[PDB]
């Protein structure tokens, strides 16, 4: 099998977060999309990656290949391309994976593929009491702001406004509204006021560079779901359990 991804930075953004969630993850190279579903070391979060063949320059994948890797290591070898260089991920034998970062210089990494414990992922919620689409820049600022005063990011949602706030000693409150043009698309079935681990969100912040907009969806006693709908068809999902 051989794939060539033209934009390594997308993959870099993904793995950067991934490495902060878990020690080892698996990149399922299926025939029509690349998958990576990974529970964190503590099972309080899930990262779901889906990169359809539509995004790759080359996509020679006939049978499902299970590319298992040290999340920390892959992230170190991805950081060799600071510019818009292309990553190439190929393998013949199922025990060795060859990674090329093609550019002015061609970096070739030959990694002894890792047979990694594929983890039974619990049943993830489809329906969220507020499914709200706000800017990824806005979301980033909102987390980064609130995180500097608490490790409890209270996320609040209504029929027009989305509140990402801190409720410690110092009270912050970031507001994405219908009229302000910050909250673009809004799907509403019930008001919800839940709080999520700020340090876990901090892990995933690098994901907010995958799409202009993030479909943040959550609910009372329901997990927070960050949906990064990229162009080409790339779906990155972060599922975070409450504190």
């Amino acid at each position: 099998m051989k794939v060539v991804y033209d934009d390594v930075r997308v993959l870099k953004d993904i793995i950067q977060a991934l490495a902060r969630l878990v020690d080892e993850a698996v990149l399922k190279f299926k025939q029509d999309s690349v998958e990576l579903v990974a529970l964190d070391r503590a099972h309080i979060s899930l990262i779901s990656v889906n990169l359809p063949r539509e995004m790759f320059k080359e996509y020679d994948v006939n049978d499902e290949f299970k590319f298992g890797f040290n999340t920390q290591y892959l992230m170190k070898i991805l950081k060799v391309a600071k510019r818009k260089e292309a990553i190439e991920i190929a393998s013949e034998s199922p025990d060795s994976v060859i990674i090329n970062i093609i550019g002015s210089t061609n970096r070739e990494f030959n990694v002894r593929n890792l047979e990694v414990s594929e983890q039974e992922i619990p049943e993830i919620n489809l329906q969220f009491d507020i499914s709200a689409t706000i800017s990824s820049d806005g979301f980033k600022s909102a987390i980064s702001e609130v995180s500097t005063v608490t490790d409890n990011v209270v996320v609040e949602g209504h029929e027009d406004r989305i509140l990402i706030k801190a409720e410690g000693e110092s009270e912050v409150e970031v507001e994405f509204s219908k009229d302000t043009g910050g909250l673009q698309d809004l799907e509403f079935s019930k008001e919800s006021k839940n709080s999520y681990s700020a340090e876990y969100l901090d892990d995933v912040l690098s994901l907010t560079k995958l799409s202009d907009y993030v479909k943040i969806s959550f609910g009372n006693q329901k997990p927070l779901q960050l949906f990064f709908n990229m162009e080409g068809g790339g779906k990155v999902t972060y599922l975070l359990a409450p504190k």
Binding site: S135, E145, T148, E169, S170, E173, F176, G181
Partner: protein
């Protein structure tokens, strides 16, 4: 009361300067506008900010008042607010203060809350002193000087020569000499009487460090064993003014 200031980043810059080593800031609202004042532990560097009423988009007051507020946390959250063309608002509250930043691009209306101490208005004590030397330069120039004065020594001696300003630090082995004149790099110089004064380099560093955020020209002014006045007009209007006490012996 109600305060709306056109550019949050500029207003944050104001807060940053006066709360340098401290986190307690006393904001005063007068008939003239907003002003806040902060001296150091050793009373050598005084940080003042004036924001005249006409510069503000909105300015309301029930009665001239002062608010003592712990900005330690507000500092952090105000920075990660990417204040491009964002507008900051400050309102009176039951609890104390209320700070709302309205972001233009993102639509984010981030609102802050802090315990304020609603005390009596402070007096704006502008030191009555004729500083013979009033030069106006870029803040970057000041920062370059500050950063490389603090590299060589503990004290900075600004003196005057023939239409030149001589900043010199370093006491024995490690000396540093700078020459600032009109058009290299001074935007305007004014030497009335030949004057020379010594200042705390650390305190100059700190004063000039606060000038970051205001791209507008900076007036520096001093005289023979007299304080140094470093004032910047804010990008969107307003005043960031530092006073550095001199060293006599």
């Amino acid at each position: 009361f109600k305060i709306v200031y056109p550019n949050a980043k500029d207003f944050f810059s104001f807060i940053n300067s006066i709360t340098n080593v401290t986190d307690s800031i006393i904001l005063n609202f007068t008939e003239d506008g907003i002003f806040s004042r902060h001296l150091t532990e050793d009373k050598v560097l005084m940080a003042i900010m004036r924001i005249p009423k006409d510069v503000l988009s909105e300015y309301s007051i029930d009665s001239p008042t002062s608010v003592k507020l712990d900005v330690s946390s507000v500092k952090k959250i105000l920075s990660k607010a990417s204040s491009k063309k964002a507008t900051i608002e400050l309102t009176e509250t039951d609890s104390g203060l209320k700070i709302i930043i309205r972001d233009e691009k993102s639509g984010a209306k981030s609102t802050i809350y802090i315990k304020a101490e609603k005390g009596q208005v402070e007096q704006l004590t502008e030191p009555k002193v004729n500083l013979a030397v009033n030069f106006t330069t870029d803040e970057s120039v000041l920062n370059v000087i500050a950063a490389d004065v603090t590299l060589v020594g503990e004290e900075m001696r600004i003196s005057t020569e023939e239409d030149k300003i001589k900043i010199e630090a370093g006491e024995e082995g490690k000396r540093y000499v700078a020459f600032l004149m009109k058009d290299k790099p001074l935007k305007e110089l004014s030497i009335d009487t030949s004057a020379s004064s010594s200042y705390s380099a650390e305190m100059f560093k700190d004063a000039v460090k606060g000038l970051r955020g205001f791209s507008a020209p900076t007036m520096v002014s001093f005289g023979e064993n007299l304080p140094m006045k470093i004032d910047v007009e804010a990008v969107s209007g307003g005043h960031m003014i530092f006073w550095i006490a001199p060293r006599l012996l």
